[PDB]
């Protein structure tokens, strides 16, 4: 995982020293990147479910855990235990390797989106990147029956607070949105 080798070799000392920390798991350490993707229900025949499956497929090769509408209450309606969003809690060291393009030069894709700010990660250092447009692997075809917009990417952190959050996400590199 070269981003995480960059963090092991270069960033851990940069961050440790500059923030004056005393122990290695006191120091910042970027954890468990997760995603969602929320579908406009699954549709009457489960076709927007297929659309969850190929979009996940775009940046995790797996299958979805697939989250279910536990309660269903107001306006999206019914079933109260049928499939909805598309979560992946990614693999470890490999997930950190994914992190080599997974929110670094994910930029030729980006057109703006509501996340990625060095002010509006939560007051707990936890954040969600809703990307819209798929990263690109280099293989054949670009007819995926596309679901144009997808993927809230919820990065998780050894972070409890504002200061560990902007340790990450900003000057760990890649930069936040300017």
């Amino acid at each position: 995982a070269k981003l995480h080798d960059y963090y092991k070799d270069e960033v851990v000392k940069k961050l440790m020293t500059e923030f004056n920390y005393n122990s290695v798991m006191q120091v910042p350490r970027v954890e468990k990147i997760t995603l969602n993707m929320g579908v406009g229900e699954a549709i009457a025949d489960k076709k927007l479910l297929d659309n969850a499956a190929a979009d996940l497929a775009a940046i995790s090769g797996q299958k979805p855990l697939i989250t279910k509408a536990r309660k269903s209450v107001a306006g999206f309606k019914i079933r109260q235990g049928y499939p909805i969003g598309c979560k992946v809690t990614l693999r470890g060291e490999r997930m950190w390797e994914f992190f080599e393009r997974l929110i670094t030069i994910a930029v030729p894709r980006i057109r703006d989106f509501r996340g990625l700010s060095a002010k509006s990660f939560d007051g707990r250092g936890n954040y969600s990147m809703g990307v819209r447009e798929q990263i690109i692997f280099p293989e054949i075809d670009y007819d995926k029956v596309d679901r144009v917009r997808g993927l809230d990417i919820t990065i998780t952190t050894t972070a409890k607070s504002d200061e560990e959050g902007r340790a990450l996400l900003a000057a760990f590199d890649f930069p936040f949105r300017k």
């Binding site: 797996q62 390797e97 980006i110 280099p138 930069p175 949105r177």
Partner: protein
């Protein structure tokens, strides 16, 4: 490490760098927080004349009458 899903993940070795080491990133303005114009450069060539006609090697000083050619 469950050995039975996830079929690819890494195989180019993640080459991207500038424009030039497979695919693009360019400048320090690599945060791409806007859309696509699809309409600027080369018509806007760095200049504001939008296709004057085919090249002459004369290009005289002032004025004319086209159907008299005198």
């Amino acid at each position: 490490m469950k050995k039975d899903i996830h079929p690819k993940y890494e195989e180019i070795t993640a080459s991207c760098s500038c424009g030039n080491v497979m695919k693009i990133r360019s400048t320090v303005g690599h945060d791409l927080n806007l859309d696509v114009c699809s309409k600027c450069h080369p018509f806007f060539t760095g200049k504001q004349r939008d296709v004057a006609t085919g090249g002459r090697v004369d290009r005289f000083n002032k004025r004319f009458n086209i159907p008299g050619s005198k």
